Symmetry: D2
Subunit: 123 residues, 4 copies
C-alpha cells in the first residue's frame, strides 16, 4: 500500500527534514533534523503506521517520536508527531505534535508544547 509512498525524505514548513523508512510490518525508522530549536544534525526516530489502511479514500494513520539527544546536544525533551499520510500528486503527511520536556514537578504544568507540521516531498 503506502510503504513506497511513505518511505523517503520529507520536509516541513519550518525547513526540517524527516527521513523515514516504512517497513512491511508497520514500523517507521529513520532520522529527523529540526531547522529550529535546541537541536543540531540528525536524531533517531521510530514510529508506527497502519500498514493496511482503508480503501475508501481515507488517509493512512501514523506517528513517530524523537528524543532530542544525539552526539552533539541533549535538549532533555521528546516530540511525538501524530498524523496521517495522504497520497497523490501532492502527497502530504499532516501532523499535530506534542513536545514534552523533562521538568521538576513544580514546573510540570508547562512541560508540554503543542503544534502542527505539514510535510511534503518538495522543499
Amino acid at each position: 500500500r503506502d510503504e513506497a509512498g511513505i518511505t523517503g525524505t520529507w520536509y516541513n514548513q519550518l525547513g526540517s527534514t524527516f527521513i523515514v523508512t516504512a517497513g512491511a510490518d508497520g514500523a517507521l525508522t529513520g532520522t529527523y533534523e529540526s531547522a529550529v530549536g535546541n537541536a543540531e544534525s540528525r536524531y533517531v526516530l521510530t514510529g508506527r503506521y497502519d500498514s493496511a489502511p482503508a480503501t475508501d479514500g481515507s488517509g493512512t494513520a501514523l506517528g513517530w517520536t524523537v528524543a532530542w539527544k544525539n552526539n552533539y546536544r541533549n535538549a532533555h525533551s521528546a516530540t511525538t508527531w501524530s498524523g496521517q499520510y495522504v497520497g497523490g500528486a501532492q502527497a502530504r503527511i499532516n501532523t499535530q505534535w506534542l513536545l514534552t520536556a523533562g521538568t521538576t514537578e513544580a514546573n510540570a504544568w508547562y512541560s508540554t508544547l503543542v503544534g502542527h507540521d505539514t510535510f511534503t516531498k518538495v522543499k
Copy 2:
C-alpha cells in the same frame, strides 16, 4: 539511569497495560493493550526516551506510538504518547496523547483526539 526504572509493566487510569523495554541506546520497544476503544489484545509500540537526563531532579522525557492494527482488528488510527518518567517510590509516567484517525480530506478537521494518561507500576 532510568533504563531499569522505565523497563517493565505499567498501567494507566483506564486499566490499559503498557509493557516496555528501555534500551541503552534510547529505544523504547514493547506492547500496548488498551482497556477502551476499538482495540483488543496487544499492539506493537515503539518510541524513544532521553537516555542521559538532567541530574537536577527533572523527569526523563519520552514518547511512543501505537498504530491500532494487529491480527484481530484494525481501527485505522494511531496514538502517540508524549510525556516524562518521574522516578521514586511512587514512580509515574505522566503523558499527554494524540490519537489520529485516517480520514477523508472532508473529515480531516475532526481526525485527532487529545487526552492525558498517567501510568503507574501498580493497578
Copy 3:
C-alpha cells in the same frame, strides 16, 4: 493597538465565519458560523485578548469559546480557540483549538478533539 485590527469578519480554511468585536477592556464578543460539523447558522462567542501587547513585533494573544447550542441545534459540545493575531497587509489569526463534548464518564477519554484554524480577512 489591535482593537481596530481584530474587530471585523474573519474566515478560516474551512469556510467558517468568525464575526468579532474587540473591546477596549480586552473583551471579545460576536458570533461564529461553522461550515462543518453539527452546526447551522450563528452561535454566540465570547473571549479575551491582550489589549496592551508587546511592541517588539510579537503577535497579540487571544482566545474565545463557542458552545454549540443555538435556536436550531445543540451539539452538546464547546470549542475554545487559543491563538495570536498577527497584523499587517496579510493579517492573520493563527489558532489551535479544543472541542470537548459532554460525555458519560465511560466515554470521557475520547471527549476532546484538537485541531488548528487559520483566519484571514479574505475568503
Copy 4:
C-alpha cells in the same frame, strides 16, 4: 439545569481559584487567579456553556478564556480551558487547556503550551 451547579468558586490541582457565574443564556463570567506562572491576583474570564445538556448522564460542555493582563502584570498570553462539568456529590470540571503566547513569527512554532486541569468545589 447546571446554572446553579456551575456557579461558584472552584479550585484546581495547582491551587488556582476559578470564580464563575453561569448565566441563563449560556454565558460564563468571572475571575481567575493562577497559583503558578507569570500571574498575580485576579484576571477577567469569559466563556460559554451548554445551557440545555443531554439528560442521558453526560457531562455539560463548557469553555472559557483568560488573557493574562490585569492591573499588576501582563504576560502577553492567553489560556483557553475546554471541558465538561460533571455534577454530583463530588462535582468536577474536567478540562484540557491551550496557553498561547504572543510571539514573533520566527518563534511561533513554540507559542502554545497544552495541559489539563481538574477543578473541584473543595481545596
